[PDB]
Amino acid sequence: RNLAELHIGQPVVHLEHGVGRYAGMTTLEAGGITGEYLMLTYANDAKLYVPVSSLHLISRYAGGAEENAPLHKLGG
C-alpha cells in the first residue's frame, strides 16, 4: 500500500499497534519536521498520527470482511 489514497473508515494495520480505522489526514508542525500526517482512530477513539514518510509501515487489512475487521487500542 502506498497509503494517502486511503478510504475513510478503512481498516489498516500499524506495525506498532495493529489494525485501526483510517480517518482522513492531519497536518502536523513539529520542531524541525513539518508536513502531512496520517490520522487513524483506534478503540476509545484513540488518535494516531503517522508521517507520510513512514507510510510503508502501514498495511491495508484485506481479509475479506473489512467491515467486521477488529479494532486495537492505543496506549494514550
Cell readout for 9 is 473508515
Burial 45-54 (b: 16+ CB within 10 A, else e): ebebebeeee
Contact 41, 48 (CB under 8 A): yes
Q: Where are the domains of the chain?
A: 10-68
SS (H, E, C) the chain: CCCCCCCCCCEEEECCCEEEEEEEEEEEECCCCEEEEEEEECECCCEEEEECCCHHHEEECCCCCHHHCCCCECCC
- Asked how this structure was determined, the answer is NMR
Instruction: List residues bridging with 21 in a β-sheet.
Output: 11, 41
Instruction: List residues bridging with 66 in a β-sheet.
Output: none
CATH 2.40.10.170 fits 10-68, yes or no: yes
What's the number of CA atoms in the CB half-sphere (13 Å) around residue 45? 0
Q: Which of 53, 60, 52 is nearest to 15 (CA)?
A: 60
Instruction: List residues bridging with 41 in a β-sheet.
Output: 21, 47
